[PDB]
Design a binder for this molecule. Structure first.
Ligand SMILES: O=c1ccn([C@@H]2O[C@H](COP(=O)(O)OP(=O)(O)OP(=O)(O)O)[C@@H](O)[C@H]2O)c(=O)[nH]1
Ligand SMILES: [Mg+2]
Length: 326
């Protein structure tokens, strides 16, 4: 359809959500963290921080950090077995404390993943993931957040994409899903950057020693042009990814303004034979460079097949206003 039609469907689709006690979740978690270690810091990251708002159906991401991790505000995160072991170790203590203080909660220690994480589901729609000793999630969320702060309404584009990604089965949170919400944000910002709707923010300027453990709410204003900006952005975003982004040659990257190529990163078919992560093949079909992790393709799970599904969906999204006009 047209931007306006899409815009209105989209604003229409978000009516129920435009109407948030995370400090409380934060404090409960800090209680636990405290009981495992009173000198440990708790940082929030993920969508809550990125958007400055807490969405229904979205967990809350927390990472636990030592004073020195924070002071080393711009240090990278060790990608070693020992670093992974240190994290699993502290998270197991914390998991223990969580369970002890909240017999109601399902506290799962997840090892399937690249980053040790403790997943808590209290049942009361209460959901959070806890990781440790890593600055990269707070850092890249502070980066995404700073991008959205430049153009607060672009958050609708992001949220529209996020929700859609989960409805089409593209989001890694869904079985068969290949790109995390995080990947989708990187895509959105990258897109916003290519259209000069955002000004480039060198990732190295983000300093963890300067981010808030719990950043402030960032009011989300309804798109008050009936969604025309959004509709136009969505359509443009869909078009950009089906027709301007050259997935075979380019990398969605926020590490530099402009274009990043697969060749300069050695993210080639050749590399696929070697590149492995979490004991599996990394794919370089849909390349999304993580701004802070070395050599990490956020689209590493996008297999040739999933790449085709992404194009299908991106094409479909155009004529369904991201599955809203139905
Ligand atoms: O591959 C990843 C995935 C996630 N992350 C980090 O973990 C955070 C949470 O990762 P999510 O994919 O859960 O993103 P999100 O919070 O924005 O969205 P939803 O839960 O609502 O689906 C992201 O903001 C990012 O900082 C990574 O660093 N790398
Ligand atoms: Mg999250």
């Amino acid at each position: 359809p047209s931007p306006a039609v899409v815009g209105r469907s989209l604003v229409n689709s978000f009516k129920q959500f435009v109407s948030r006690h995370v400090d409380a979740t934060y404090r409960l978690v800090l209680d636990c963290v405290a009981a495992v270690d009173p000198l440990m810091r708790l940082y929030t990251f993920g969508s809550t921080v990125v958007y400055g708002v807490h969405e229904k159906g979205s967990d809350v991401d927390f990472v636990v950090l030592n004073k020195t991790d924070v002071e080393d505000g711009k240090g990278g995160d060790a990608a070693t077995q020992v670093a992974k072991g240190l994290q699993a170790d502290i998270l197991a203590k914390l998991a223990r404390v969580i369970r002890q203080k909240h017999l109601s909660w399902n506290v799962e220690e997840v090892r399937r993943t690249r980053v040790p994480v403790v997943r808590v589901k209290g049942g009361g729609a209460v959901d959070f993931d806890i990781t440790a000793y890593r600055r990269n999630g707070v850092r890249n969320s502070a980066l995404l957040r700073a991008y959205f702060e430049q153009n607060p309404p672009c958050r609708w584009l992001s949220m529209s994409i996020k929700r859609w990604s989960k409805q089409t089965g593209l989001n890694a949170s869904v079985i068969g899903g290949s790109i995390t919400s995080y990947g989708f944000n990187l895509m959105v910002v990258y897109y916003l950057l290519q259209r000069n709707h955002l000004q480039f923010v060198p990732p190295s300027t983000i300093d963890v020693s300067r981010v808030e453990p719990l950043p402030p709410h960032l009011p989300l204003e309804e798109p008050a042009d009936e969604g025309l900006e959004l509709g136009t952005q969505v359509l443009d975003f869909l078009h950009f990814f089906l027709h301007e982004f050259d997935s075979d040659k380019q990398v969605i990257s926020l590490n530099r303004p402009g274009i990043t190529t697969k060749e300069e990163l050695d993210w080639t078919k050749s590399a696929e034979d070697f590149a492995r992560m979490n004991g599996e093949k990394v794919h370089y079909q849909w390349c999304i460079e993580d701004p802070y992790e070395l050599n990490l393709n956020v689209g590493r799970n996008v297999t040739p097949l999933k790449r085709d599904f992404l194009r299908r969906h991106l094409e479909k999204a155009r004529d369904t206003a991201l599955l809203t006009i139905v």
